[PDB]
Write a protein that binds this DNA or RNA. Structure first.
Ligand SMILES: [Zn+2]
Ligand SMILES: [Zn+2]
Ligand SMILES: [Zn+2]
Ligand SMILES: [Zn+2]
Ligand SMILES: [Zn+2]
Ligand SMILES: [Zn+2]
Ligand SMILES: [Zn+2]
Ligand SMILES: [Zn+2]
Lengths: 95, 86, 253, 98, 107, 97, 97, 82, 104, 95, 254, 105
DNA sequence: TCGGATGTATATATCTGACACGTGCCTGGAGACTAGGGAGTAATCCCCTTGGCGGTTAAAACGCGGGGGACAGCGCGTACGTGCGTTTAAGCGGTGCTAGAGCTGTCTACGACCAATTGAGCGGCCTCGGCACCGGGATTCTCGA
DNA sequence: CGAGAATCCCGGTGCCGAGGCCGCTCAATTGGTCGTAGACAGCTCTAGCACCGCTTAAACGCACGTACGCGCTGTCCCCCGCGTTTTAACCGCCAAGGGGATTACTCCCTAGTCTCCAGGCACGTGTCAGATATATACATCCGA
């Protein structure tokens, strides 16, 4: 059948978290999916270029953070870095 | 063994259609020389996009241009499109 | 800048009152300090603007930024999103401490009545406004001509219609009294930016009427409704004052 | 005897009408024919997915509307309420397409 | 040995392992840190939430309990930062912002 | 009527250990301090003395603003605080040019 | 005496500066401007001469590119003098605001 | 802390830029506007440049940082590297 | 060398090495760096040619960046290729609008 | 020193091919270098995305050619393609 | 479309080649316009042919024509982006080599001036003239009279022509020095002629310029005039211009 | 000065490779600058999309988009070859002398 | 100065289908592990950024006469909007035909990879000629009559 | 026509960066095993293409007319040009030393790999969000 992966269930979970009594259309679902994919490619790309610029062969959380600082504008970047740091810290603690 | 050559379909884009697009664009009054210009611009845009798309198609050794080819073509022109994949 | 003064460099701390002291409070005391300028009621889920430190209710400021300009409702400064704000725990906890009752509904009608009380308690200068009868959405206003402007003792009548999404949408304010003015229509329509584009959800009828009096004091010939009047006001000044005083002594007095 | 709006009201009504809508404005089949006519100069006997044509039309109409906004701005900038080819050409020029 | 997901340990919803895999087999670098997938997943999840929130608001405004592309468009094009982020992005079936110039308004 | 012994920490400065004299808050965290306190505090550390959040990248003075809305509350709640402050200010500026 | 018609030596200035390739903005105060702007991101910064030169090249290129579109926006409105609204329109269509 | 320095972009310099841009007549409110635009531009570039410098853990802004910033901003610059 | 075997001046080996790193793909074709170096050599040849002519027109023998700018901007294809590219010390093409010319 | 390399000698060689009695300054040479590197990264990048889009893990001369067809506009593409197809032919006549 | 063969074309018989060894006589002006470069006014050398319009030029000539000026065809104004929009034509080179074995490796810029001078003296345009004042060929004096059916009918008008160093790649500076009351003709001497400003092509000659001015005298262009005072003079319209220009210019010429 | 040369020496530059005769209504493919008779190359491009001589692809889809009427060349072959134009015109007149349809051809 | 003809905002019955959740399933993610190695980090050579005389002079400021141009007012005129009648074809679906995308198993030619090893290419030194510099004078646009 | 700069032109000269040689380091070349991606014939079936009468929405055509593009024009005014005066960028350049480059080296961290298994997707199914439509009431535009 060749299953094709997607971010549907995840963005759905997020939707239930932020808005428990709202729904989502298939079109808007695909749009959100394409969005997350695009941002992923952007951040990962900039992080890759960051690793290559400094003669490094490893993309750490630092490259990702810097990439987010470069891509996302203003408060969006601030909250993004905040959530990222929170997540990597909570992950670091809980083995 | 089936061929078909199309001619003068640029006139398919009608005056009231361009008018509607202009309305959505927020235009109150439209000149007469606007429509032909619009047809030309649309023709060029489609020329470029479809050219790149077909390039992607031929690179994939396919005889059917898919939606992803259009998405890639638009993306490489700095016009990313959500809601069709990618 | 932030250069400390001669006293600030050696300022002595004020010791906190440790002894048991009870302080009687009143709802009119910390009224203006705890009132959301949008809904004109007690603060709830206090959100504070990062750039100007202005307190709003969460629902109020969100609905304001979603259904209007991206400005601060009080000082009109750039406010792109809720991320340009920050929740205020200390403030909200203070309010919930002093006022255990909390807040209620945030209807447009409630805020209209709040404006009614806000007018009855402290009336504006040479301005007034009140309901025509039982309906609270159909108001009538009265604006007396200012001293400086050539409309002395005019006492003009106005009509005010509040929309359902008040205050997030400006009320239809028009004139019922004939007045010779470049910014005022021959029917009664008013050319005022705060009544159309640059409306703020923190504005009240009082501030609007005051803006109209200030408009009478200093007309705006840039974008008028009646062109010839503006032309007369720009080219000459005697004819403008004369005709204005005539229309004032005929259609107003 | 009959009822006629002043020349300007219906236009604004249309503007309010289509700025709220999201569906496509250009007819489907003619646009498809245009797409295939333009494509027949790059590859013979081309087959098109429906989603591909739809994507092309979405991007096309989006582009045209976006251009019409800037064009309108150019028209208003010259103290006019009518868009003219000069406006489109100026928009294209500044955008870096011409 | 009672296995748990990396997303659960990071307190996230977005798949950490999947992001890690995509980073590895996405031709981005020879090696990838252990903080990269959780950080990236965190950022993606945050942006997702931030969009879905405003989209839910715009959906509520139109008396609809299901978010449509129009709501996403209304959510993004009003948010200046989100708009700058998606400036070269065209949202399908999203239409445009209702905006009429003052000059075109009736006299 | 409420006891003032409970409304203290909402009006207490954690730098001088007293009431807010000319309140000044940090933008990124809304944590309130005294002006005379927080101005000379940020002459060394560019971080918050409470939540340890970075006030600003280089110049913290750009991210602090005078909170008159709060200071008014402090002055209206605490009995004879404005009078005391004014009295001491005048008394100090009396023996100085 | 000796006079020139307003718009002649200006046109000659256009023709002269379009031929040249050297930088136009004064180097030192531009460098001072760069160092002034950079202090809001990282304290005590050092700059390569090539870095400042790069910033100046990019800046002058950007501005001289913007002035063309501005000029076109001025001529489009049946005028020969550039105005702030022309710059606003130019940057608007460019997609910057 | 540096001074205002926004006035460093003098009138005749902006005039020169307009001349090279092909401008015959310049308004008076053009200069301040230009200063503002240049300020925003330089801010946007230097921000990303300093970001690149910080990620490299350096206290000195290199030319390559500027080049990378401009390139990711969409204004590639030749004659310095990259 | 592979450059000599392909009749190219640009380094096929260096291009191949650069394609190996940089994280473009897992493995790289054997004819790929030849093709790429060929394209680079072609573009270099075209630009250096046009700029050489531009240098000739300016009575110069050494090509300055100004000549490169003149060469690139006088070619619609090259200009499109370098649309978002700023050439240092290149200046602008001489252009004065018709309505700016003296009248009366 | 670390032996900082470039495309100097090659650009110079091609220059002496197209113009025997014509030199080049340092700045212009650096600009040409930046051009070569830019075009390199662009073509190689588009080729990488090409290979990735078709689930193929190899960048052959085909991906490079298609990338050129996508990047270089008009005649600039055509000739270039030829110059490619030519080279890869000669390389297969002596290997 | 436009390639559908007609009744004759669908069955036309081949024109058999003359195989018997007979010689053909050709004067050095027989294949003039067919083998002449429109730019340097001389025989072709290293022939380049435009892909869009099939127009032949010299290599260096058309390349330099492209680099310095509009990116269009000097003969038919059709656009070509660069030197890649034209292919080398070895057939013309071989034909020329067989017919005229004399490439003459020396072109521009005085030579084109002289050839254009011979082309000027051979057959001048309608009621016009042009020729160097002295030994210097870069400074010409052109005498143009008054054309019939025009408000300037009758009289004489002298003007000076300054040929640039990079001629004909740059338009010659034509200055009208006889004070004529004309919209596009400035009182100082400058002429607002589009083909002499931005719409200049290396395939243009002094003959075509003077002819363009000759046609300009009859029907001027009030769209972009040099002086705004005459803009209303043609709003009179064509009734007061024949009594104001024929008494200020024609009366000051004849 | 007057030059004279054998016409057979000039024939290879004036003859069509498709019909073996002189160029009539010369038409040139532009991707390689190759000339044929109009009818010859038009009929040929319905059988092949590549050049008859150098096998270079005329066009990827529609070859007719890359052919142009070569007037100057036709003028050359009309001036060099004596009485060719008169003969061709004679053929055109004699053909429509019995067929009354479509004059402009 | 205002009430009636348009058509937009609004309300609610009602059928339709796509959103949404349950399920068997299968593969990708998790867990325990070793050891090569990129990266951390203290150490150290030394390039290049930074400060600051003071002395110059071209460049930047300030000011003033005034001429070209921005801009508000007005009017001849035509191009475009509004609305209804005629007419073109888009949109509908019903559906058979099959091109060709998609997946699978098999055979096999492609390229990374370790290794041996020599020159291609970069850091570096030096004579020299392109070119910036320099000043007398050719001369060509400009402004007034 | 004629005065007056001001760009261009021409012969001379001081200067430093372009170009060629050379020491030599290290990366490209030569050559062979082998895991494996890629070529490819083979095969299931989704989905694109042609078909084709029909209700009708919509494009089209056209007459009437008024808001609006456009040329004309008088008047306030604001940049232009230019001499004088004020100001600091520019330059030579020795000198303190931050700090970027490089190097020697211990080691934490991630690729690599076999296994267990549940998170994730394709599939199936019931119904509520919303499209739908008759039907209100409503805000809004405009002439006698
Ligand atoms: Zn509130
Ligand atoms: Zn505020
Ligand atoms: Zn804090
Ligand atoms: Zn304190
Ligand atoms: Zn041509
Ligand atoms: Zn020639
Ligand atoms: Zn033939
Ligand atoms: Zn051929």
């Amino acid at each position: 059948k060749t299953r094709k992966e997607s971010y549907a269930i995840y963005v759905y979970k997020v939707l239930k978290q932020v808005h428990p009594d709202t729904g989502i259309s298939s079109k808007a679902m695909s749009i959100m999916n394409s969005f997350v994919n695009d941002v992923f490619e952007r951040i990962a790309g900039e992080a890759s270029r960051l690793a290559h610029y400094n003669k490094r062969s490893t993309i750490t959380s630092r490259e990702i953070q810097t990439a987010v600082r470069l891509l996302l504008p203003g408060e969006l970047a601030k909250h993004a870095v905040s959530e990222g740091t929170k997540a990597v810290t909570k992950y670091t603690s809980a083995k | 063994r089936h061929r078909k050559v199309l001619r003068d379909n640029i006139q398919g884009i009608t005056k009231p259609a361009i008018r509607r697009l202009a309305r959505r664009g927020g235009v109150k009054r439209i000149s007469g020389l606007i429509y032909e210009e619009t047809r030309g611009v649309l023709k060029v845009f489609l020329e470029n996009v479809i050219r790149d798309a077909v390039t992607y198609t031929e690179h994939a050794k396919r005889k059917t241009v898919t939606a992803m080819d259009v998405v890639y073509a638009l993306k490489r022109q700095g016009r990313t499109l959500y809601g069709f994949g990618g | 800048t932030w250069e400390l003064s001669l006293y600030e460099l050696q300022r002595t701390p004020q010791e906190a009152i440790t002894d048991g002291l009870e302080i009687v409070v009143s709802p009119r005391s910390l009224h203006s300090e705890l009132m959301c300028p949008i809904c004109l009621d007690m603060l709830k889920n206090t959100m504070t603007t990062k750039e100007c430190l202005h307190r709003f209710c969460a629902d109020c400021i969100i609905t304001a930024l979603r259904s209007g300009n991206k400005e601060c409702p009080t000082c009109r400064k750039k406010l792109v999103s809720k991320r340009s704000l920050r929740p205020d725990p200390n403030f909200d906890a203070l309010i919930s401490k002093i006022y255990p009752s909390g807040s209620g509904s945030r209807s447009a009608l409630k805020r209209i009545n709040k404006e009614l009380s806000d007018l009855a308690r402290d009336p504006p200068a040479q301005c007034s406004a009140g309901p025509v009868g039982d309906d609270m959405f159909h108001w009538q206003a009265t604006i007396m001509g200012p001293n400086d402007s050539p409309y002395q003792g005019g006492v003009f009548f106005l009509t005010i219609h509040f929309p359902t999404d008040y205050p997030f949408k400006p009320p239809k304010v028009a004139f019922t009294t004939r007045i010779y003015h470049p910014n005022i229509n021959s029917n009664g329509s008013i050319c005022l930016d705060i009544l159309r584009s640059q409306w703020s959800p923190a504005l009240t009828i009082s501030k609007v009427l005051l803006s109209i009096c200030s408009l009478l004091c200093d007309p705006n010939p840039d974008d008028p409704l009646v062109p010839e009047i503006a032309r007369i006001y720009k080219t000459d000044r005697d004819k403008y004052n004369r005709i204005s005083r005539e229309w004032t002594q005929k259609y107003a007095m | 005897k009959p009822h006629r709006y002043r020349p300007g009201t219906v236009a604004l009504r249309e503007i309010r009408r289509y700025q709220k809508s999201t569906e496509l404005l250009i007819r489907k089949l003619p646009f498809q024919r245009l797409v295939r006519e333009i494509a027949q100069d790059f590859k013979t006997d081309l087959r098109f997915q429906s989603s591909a044509v739809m994507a092309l039309q979405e991007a096309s109409e989006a582009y045209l509307v976006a251009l019409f906004e800037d064009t309108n701005l150019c028209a208003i900038h010259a103290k006019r309420v009518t868009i003219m080819p000069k406006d489109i050409q100026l928009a294209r020029r500044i955008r870096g397409e011409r | 040995a009672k296995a748990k997901t990396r997303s659960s340990r990071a307190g996230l919803q977005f798949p950490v392992g999947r992001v890690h895999r995509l980073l590895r087999k996405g031709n981005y670098a020879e090696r990838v840190g252990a903080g990269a997938p959780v950080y990236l997943a965190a950022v993606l999840e945050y942006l997702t939430a931030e969009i879905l929130e405003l989209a839910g608001n715009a959906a509520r405004d139109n008396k609809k309990t299901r978010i449509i592309p129009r709501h996403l468009q209304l959510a993004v094009r009003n948010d200046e930062e989100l708009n700058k982020l998606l400036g070269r992005v065209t949202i399908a079936q999203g239409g445009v912002l209702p905006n009429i110039q003052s000059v075109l308004l009736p006299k | 009527r409420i006891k003032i012994t409970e409304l203290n920490p909402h009006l207490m400065c954690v730098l001088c250990g007293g009431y807010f004299i000319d309140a000044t808050t940090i933008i990124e965290c809304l944590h309130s301090f005294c002006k005379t306190c927080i101005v000379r505090y940020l002459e060394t550390s560019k971080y918050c003395p409470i939540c340890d959040v970075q006030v600003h990248k280089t110049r913290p003075l750009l991210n602090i603003r005078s909170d008159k809305t709060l200071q008014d509350i402090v002055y209206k709640l605490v009995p004879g605080l404005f009078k005391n402050e004014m009295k001491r200010r005048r008394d100090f500026y009396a023996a100085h040019p």
